[PDB]
Amino acid sequence: MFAVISPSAFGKLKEILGSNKNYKFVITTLGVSFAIKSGIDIDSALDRGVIVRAFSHKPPKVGNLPQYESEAIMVAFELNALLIAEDKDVINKAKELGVNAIPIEELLASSLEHHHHHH
């Protein structure tokens, strides 16, 4: 199953990759560009096996969300993938589309470590 990362999840790419693993992590063209412009380590993602998928052109439907998050959602929609998103609205908007967008810490919670419910 693919796991598409939204740009809102950047910086914590190491975390999701190294903890959960087992998914086919995917990042977008605008995604990698976001890392490049801001100066974020996208190489750590590629290093662990995050693939970059770019669609040629697919109409994105979003009103609040910017293109870089949109492309991530779109690619997750395309593949019917797991969407790793930190932004509250990115999660809920992708959820509308039928994409299981979840926060990083929940991706870490589903890392199959089997941790007992602790307080």
PDB file of C-alpha atoms in Angstrom, residues 37 41 51 54 58 71 103:
ATOM      1  CA  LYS A  37      12.780  25.753  -1.261  1.00  0.00           C
ATOM      2  CA  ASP A  41      15.994  17.141   4.230  1.00  0.00           C
ATOM      3  CA  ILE A  51       9.291   7.529  -4.194  1.00  0.00           C
ATOM      4  CA  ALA A  54       4.179  13.068 -10.351  1.00  0.00           C
ATOM      5  CA  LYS A  58      -5.004  15.828 -12.965  1.00  0.00           C
ATOM      6  CA  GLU A  71      -0.965  17.292  -5.189  1.00  0.00           C
ATOM      7  CA  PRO A 103      -1.545  12.599  11.607  1.00  0.00           C
TER       8      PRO A 103
END
